[PDB]
């Protein structure tokens, strides 16, 4: 017949006219009964019409369609640690998503493939239940129920064909220390087939270095144990009679560097075969030629395994390429920092040949930068001549700067505050800028520390550090220990090695003090100065203008600039005085930061941070007491309070601070506490031995987006601060600190949150071995 009109019944995403064009029975066109049957498959070919029933009212057509389209939602239930988007990726594999055709027939197709996904997980013990839940006009919520039973766990490895080596040494291709007896549950040994293929190629490298060059894993048969968990295996291998490197006959385009290549192939004819060393030895040439230019150094070994003397013969086929390749270089991921900041952290130059060891060394300074997130590049050949290889340094950069502050003492008191903020890499220039200070009524403190780290082409660390402490300890008078300390410190850092870098400086120590507190250890220094201030009174002035020569040295063989993981940086910082200084003394200090990998994948790494110090006079005097060492609270040792680790002084039997306030800020003074009051703040010692033992661990509850920039780390703190010149006669009922056996102790965990204002470090720690005057707040909040 011919259609009068069509009833377009049920579309949900299709248009009425779009159904009409997809109908071959469109309005006004001749409609046979076969064209009706042609329509059903063609409206099934729309991919959105779940039912198609093309009917007619004599000639007036009407197409009863139930429809497939938009899925309203996809609900995941039981969607545990095997996450739901990868489960949705199987829905994205099976064509279904929110917005899309459902085709409710394909549920078991999804419910098979999700199990086949669960099969590939390391499980098969799971079930998936896709539930259709209707929403408006066709729409469907896809409730998916994941009754995941269990994964598979590695239990036993059985290998046949082992010639001379134990299967158990190949079981150790993955390391375990754990247990689950319900009282020592620390994880398991679960299965993944890529652990196996890794252990397979661990087993491949296990026998290649032995000499086995008829070595071949014949076949491998992993168990179908009736639990869907039990991982047993039947590996068939042939080690096959360990062969020897009996000769290297390296050939090909040796580029005139063949003797240098021969240095890389200085071998022993007849030593047992090590193809991994041979694999290394090819890479020796590829970097040597890579240092000789030749970015495409096609080096092809051929171990002609000589089975007659049970050896090998090492043919090698070398093709270096062209020497000059570094035309220019590009830099990317650089929209905020200046390019020449990163470009000065480079060693391979444009318009040159390639030094392969220059580009990573430049990237290592970029790796040791810190305000990067990633450091990498794109070493693309610009097409055309073999002189055009543009190295596109696309990196990712991290935020610069951090603010610090104190606690309390504001808006219910005077105009008084603690400040301090940093602008290292100042505005993308690279200027290490750190400025701190505080304006209170007790004191007015100024401090700047600004560096031109790269002031010459050598990388001269032009660093200036100026300071001014108008410190009065002004509670009701300044005669409670006035101290005007100010001056300069100009310092320079120099390449000697590019790991071993020396430091030097000068200190102008203009300390102008009046009316000293009667604590004896302070005053013993004044007696060491030959000055005899009146013991029972804070009335005595003391101005010094000390001229010191500072020095130091940096070790730098350690990975990154803000989050390293392997290596060590040792930092000597020392000083001495000069003839002309108002006191002749010295003070040496050292800190190290070694990164020893517990996990060789560096998920756990030893952080060895310890500080050593010693300072004394150059003769006749001692080190000044304000240069004595301390710890506690914000130190290596947490859970204590600040300046609570060290020797503790005793006040003189005292009267006149020129009025200490009544029964407040006592120094065995006129308002009580007399007859040698022992001070309890750590007045600190002329020697130091403190440490903290930190261990990087990742967190799974937070995603690893920043858990590799968040350094969660446990510790157990130990360390001593002690005055090796502590008196035993003056301090006889007072503790002797001449020994380093004043070893304080605490333990806890640090919480480094890498904010947009940088790392924010919080730490609860519990002291267990304390001493006199060790005041302790067990939580330490630091910025």
């Amino acid at each position: 017949f011919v259609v009068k009109d069509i009833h377009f019944e049920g579309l949900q995403r299709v248009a009425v006219g779009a159904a009409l064009l997809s109908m071959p029975v469109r309005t006004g066109d001749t409609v046979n009964d076969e064209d009706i049957s042609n329509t059903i498959r063609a409206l099934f070919a729309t991919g959105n019409f779940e039912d198609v029933r093309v009917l007619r009212d004599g000639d007036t057509l009407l197409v009863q369609v139930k429809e497939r389209p938009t899925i309203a939602s996809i609900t995941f239930s039981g969607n545990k640690s095997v996450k739901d988007d990868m489960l949705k990726q199987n829905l994205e594999a099976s064509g279904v998503r929110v917005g899309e055709s459902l085709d409710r027939t394909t549920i078991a197709d999804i419910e098979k493939g999700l199990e086949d996904f669960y099969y590939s997980v390391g499980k098969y013990s799971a079930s998936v239940k896709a539930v259709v839940t209707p929403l408006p006009r066709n729409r469907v919520d896809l409730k998916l129920v994941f009754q995941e039973g269990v994964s598979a766990e590695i239990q036993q490895i059985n290998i046949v064909g082992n010639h001379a080596f134990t299967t158990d040494e190949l079981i150790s291709h993955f390391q375990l220390r754990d247990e689950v007896p319900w009282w020592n549950v620390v994880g398991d040994r679960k299965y993944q087939k890529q652990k196996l293929a890794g252990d397979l190629e661990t087993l491949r490298s296990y026998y290649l270095d032995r000499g086995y060059a008829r070595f071949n894993i014949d076949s491998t048969q992993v168990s179908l144990t009736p639990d869907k968990k039990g991982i047993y295996v039947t590996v068939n291998i042939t080690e096959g009679d360990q062969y020897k490197l009996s000769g290297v006959e390296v050939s090909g385009n040796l580029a005139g560097h063949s003797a240098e290549i021969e240095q890389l192939t200085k071998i022993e004819p007849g030593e047992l075969y090590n193809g991994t060393k041979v694999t290394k030895m090819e890479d020796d040439i590829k970097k040597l030629l890579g240092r000789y230019g030749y970015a495409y150094p096609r080096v092809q070994s051929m171990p002609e395994i000589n089975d007659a003397d049970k050896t090998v013969k090492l043919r090698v086929n070398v093709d270096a390429g062209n020497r000059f390749y570094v035309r220019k270089i590009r830099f990317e991921g650089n929209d905020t920092s200046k390019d020449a900041v990163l470009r000065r952290e480079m060693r391979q130059m444009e318009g040159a040949w390639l030094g392969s060891d220059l580009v990573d060394q430049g990237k290592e300074r970029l790796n040791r930068l810190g305000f990067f997130e990633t450091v990498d590049t794109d070493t693309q050949r610009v097409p055309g001549s073999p002189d055009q290889v543009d190295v596109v340094y696309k990196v990712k950069e991290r935020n610069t700067g951090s603010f610090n502050f104190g606690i309390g003492y504001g808006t219910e008191s005077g105009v008084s505050f603690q400040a301090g903020v940093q602008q290292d890499n100042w505005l993308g220039t690279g200027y290490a800028v750190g400025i701190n200070g505080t304006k209170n009524d007790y004191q007015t403190y100024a401090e700047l520390s600004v560096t031109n780290p790269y002031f010459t082409v050598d990388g001269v660390s032009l660093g200036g550090r100026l300071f001014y402490n108008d410190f009065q300890a002004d509670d009701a008078d300044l005669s409670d220990y006035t101290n005007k300390s100010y001056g300069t410190d100009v310092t320079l850092g120099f390449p000697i090695n590019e790991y071993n870098s020396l430091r030097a400086g000068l200190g102008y120590v203009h300390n102008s003090l009046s009316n000293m507190q009667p604590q004896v250890a302070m005053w013993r220094y004044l007696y060491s100065m030959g000055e005899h201030p009146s013991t029972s009174d804070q009335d005595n002035s003391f101005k010094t203008d000390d001229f010191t020569f500072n020095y130091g040295w940096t070790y730098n063989k350690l990975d990154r600039g803000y989050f390293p993981t392997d290596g060590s940086r040792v930092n000597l910082t020392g000083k001495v005085t000069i003839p002309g200084s108002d006191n002749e003394y010295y003070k040496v200090t050292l800190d190290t930061a070694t990164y020893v990998p517990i996990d060789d994948d560096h998920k756990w790494v030893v952080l060895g941070r310890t500080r050593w110090g010693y300072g004394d006079g150059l003769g006749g005097k001692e080190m000044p007491f304000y240069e004595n060492f301390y710890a506690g609270g914000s130190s290596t040792v947490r859970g204590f309070q600040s300046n609570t680790i060290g020797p503790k002084a005793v006040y003189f039997p005292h009267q006149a601070s020129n009025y200490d306030p009544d029964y407040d800020y006592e120094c065995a003074t006129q308002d009580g506490a007399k007859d040698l009051c022992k001070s309890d703040d750590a007045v600190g010692g002329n020697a130091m031995a403190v440490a903290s033992l930190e261990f990087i661990t990742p967190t799974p509850f937070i995603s690893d987006k920043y858990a590799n920039s968040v350094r969660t780390s446990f510790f157990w703190d130990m360390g001593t601060v002690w005055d090796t010149n502590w008196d035993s006669s003056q301090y006889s009922g007072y503790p002797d600190y001449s020994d380093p056996s004043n070893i304080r102790m605490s333990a806890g965990i640090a919480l480094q949150w890498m904010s947009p204002l940088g790392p924010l470090v919080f730490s609860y720690a519990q002291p267990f071995k304390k001493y006199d005057g060790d005041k302790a707040e067990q939580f330490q909040f630091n910025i």
Partner: protein, 218 residues
């Protein structure tokens, strides 16, 4: 977002929250307006008003997401000049943004990453639609990013000047030369590369360029 509703009350609340300036709540309407009705009669204008909601809320990859939606939803449209505007306008906000500008410290030479991307979209705009309301606006930005490339490419030519790679000085100057003539920074790159010649003792090759300086004195 919006539940299953009449589309025009979603569209009214879309245009309200744009006039309210509540771009997120317009984003709440406009997306669910096109999530259930991408066949809407204003679903093309929705994607434009999404970019209006996105860029005025500074949602730059989402504005580009509404661009590539509108690329897929309207591969032909009168407002693709708007798209080739809103492509280049997004990348300009995407390239450099800092509060240091009053201090004489600017990001116009750090990296022109999306600025080169903004250059492409805006030059496409003034090529594909040199009649639009957007091609006159984009030209001064295309003027600007040429200078932002000129500020960028002079500083790397400045870098190899302190480095001493005088082949790299001449090459980065020729990068300024071969890419944009209408820059004084290229004209100050004209003595910069002939210095590199004289440090390479190519004084004769240098003084040819001083004639170009004598030529480009004007």
């Amino acid at each position: 977002e919006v539940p299953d509703n009449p589309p025009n009350e979603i569209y009214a609340t879309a245009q309200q929250k744009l006039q309210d300036g509540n771009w997120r709540q317009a984003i709440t309407q406009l997306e669910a307006l096109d999530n259930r009705y991408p066949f809407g009669p204003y679903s093309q204008q929705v994607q434009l008003d999404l970019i209006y909601a996105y860029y005025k809320n500074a949602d730059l990859p989402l504005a580009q997401a509404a661009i590539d939606r509108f690329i897929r939803l309207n591969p032909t449209h009168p407002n693709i000049d708007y798209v080739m505007y809103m492509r280049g306008l997004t990348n300009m906000a995407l390239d450099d943004s800092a509060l240091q500008g009053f201090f004489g410290v600017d990001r116009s030479d750090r990296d022109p990453q999306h600025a080169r991307a903004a250059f492409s979209d805006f030059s496409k705009l003034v090529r594909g639609y040199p009649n639009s309301q957007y091609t006159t606006d984009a030209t001064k930005r295309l003027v600007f990013l040429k200078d932002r490339l000129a500020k960028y490419e002079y500083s790397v030519a400045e870098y190899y000047t302190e480095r001493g790679a005088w082949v790299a000085v001449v090459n980065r100057v020729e990068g300024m030369l071969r890419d944009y003539p209408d820059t004084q920074a290229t004209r100050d790159a004209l003595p910069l590369m002939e210095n590199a010649y004289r440090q390479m003792q190519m004084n004769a090759q240098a003084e040819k360029v001083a004639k170009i300086i004598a030529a480009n004195s004007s």
